[PDB]
Amino acid sequence: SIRLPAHLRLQPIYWSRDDVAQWLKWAENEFSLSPIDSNTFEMNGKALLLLTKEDFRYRSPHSGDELYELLQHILPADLGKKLLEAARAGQDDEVRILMANGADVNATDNDGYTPLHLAASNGHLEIVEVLLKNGADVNASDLTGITPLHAAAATGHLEIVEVLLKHGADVNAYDNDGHTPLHLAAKYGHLEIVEVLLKHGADVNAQDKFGKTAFDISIDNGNEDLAEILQKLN
Ligand SMILES: [Cl-]
Ligand code: NA
Ligand code: NA
Ligand code: NA
Ligand code: NA
Ligand code: NA
Ligand code: NA
Ligand code: NA
Ligand code: NA
Numbered sequence: 001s002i003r004l005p006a007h008l009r010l011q012p013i014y015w016s017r018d019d020v021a022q023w024l025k026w027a028e029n030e031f032s033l034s035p036i037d038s039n040t041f042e043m044n045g046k047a048l049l050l051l052t053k054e055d056f057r058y059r060s061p062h063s064g065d066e067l068y069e070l071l072q073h074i075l076p077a078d079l080g081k082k083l084l085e086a087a088r089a090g091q092d093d094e095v096r097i098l099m100a101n102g103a104d105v106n107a108t109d110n111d112g113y114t115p116l117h118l119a120a121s122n123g124h125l126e127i128v129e130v131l132l133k134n135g136a137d138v139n140a141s142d143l144t145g146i147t148p149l150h151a152a153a154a155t156g157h158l159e160i161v162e163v164l165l166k167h168g169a170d171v172n173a174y175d176n177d178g179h180t181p182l183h184l185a186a187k188y189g190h191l192e193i194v195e196v197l198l199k200h201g202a203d204v205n206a207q208d209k210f211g212k213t214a215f216d217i218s219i220d221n222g223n224e225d226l227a228e229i230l231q232k233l234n
Contacts, residue, residue: 015045080107087115112142145175153181178208186214204234
């Protein structure tokens with residue numbers, strides 16, 4: 001038995017093509033495989049993770065199934081949890097690889113956050129787009145009632161707000177405090193998001209648990225520019 005080199009103990013998404021080649025040679029020795037042909041897996045580790053098991057079998061009639069299993073065993077068991085983390089951290093390529101390997105696009109943590117909530121909150125537009133294209137629940141509430149549109153409106157991510165609306169986000173969804181996305185955009189001073197929400201049917205007269213409209217919130221915060229938009233339309 002041979003120990004795997006230290007840089008190959010990194011997750012395979014980080015492996016170069018030369019790293020892949022070293023891993024193959026390590027496996028040839030560790031598992032007593034038929035000699036591996038040097039031109040056979042001419043790609044980096046990110047690409048390797050997108051091959052199917054059938055692809056491995058075709059590429060290596062003698063060892064490809066074994067190599068596929070070895071590679072998959074390197075990955076953590078809970079890909080849905082990894083997807084939540086990758087989406088939160090903006091790891092767009094990792095998001096794509098994890099969903100290709102079966103991660104649930106609607107993976108949910110103990111706060112009710114989904115990948116879409118986390119990518120929306122942290123401004124990761126490309127990840128929002130890939131999640132939506134692959135069936136992400138656009139109107140899922142988290143435990144406090146926050147939808148992805150709430151999360152993008154509160155955090156000032158205008159393009160994400162627009163994409164969520166184009167994919168069916170509920171413009172007048174309520175969180176557990178009765179806040180709509182319009183309330184949260186007003187609370188955090190995002191004037192352009194307020195305009196987009198109104199153009200998509202946001203209810204200026206919606207009252208939260210405190211009896212307050214988005215306009216009331218703009219007055220409490222002294223944000224006269226936001227109050228002006230809201231006043232015009234109600
Ligand atoms: Cl999953
Ligand atoms: Na590379
Ligand atoms: Na290298
Ligand atoms: Na090949
Ligand atoms: Na696969
Ligand atoms: Na290994
Ligand atoms: Na999983
Ligand atoms: Na889940
Ligand atoms: Na940001």
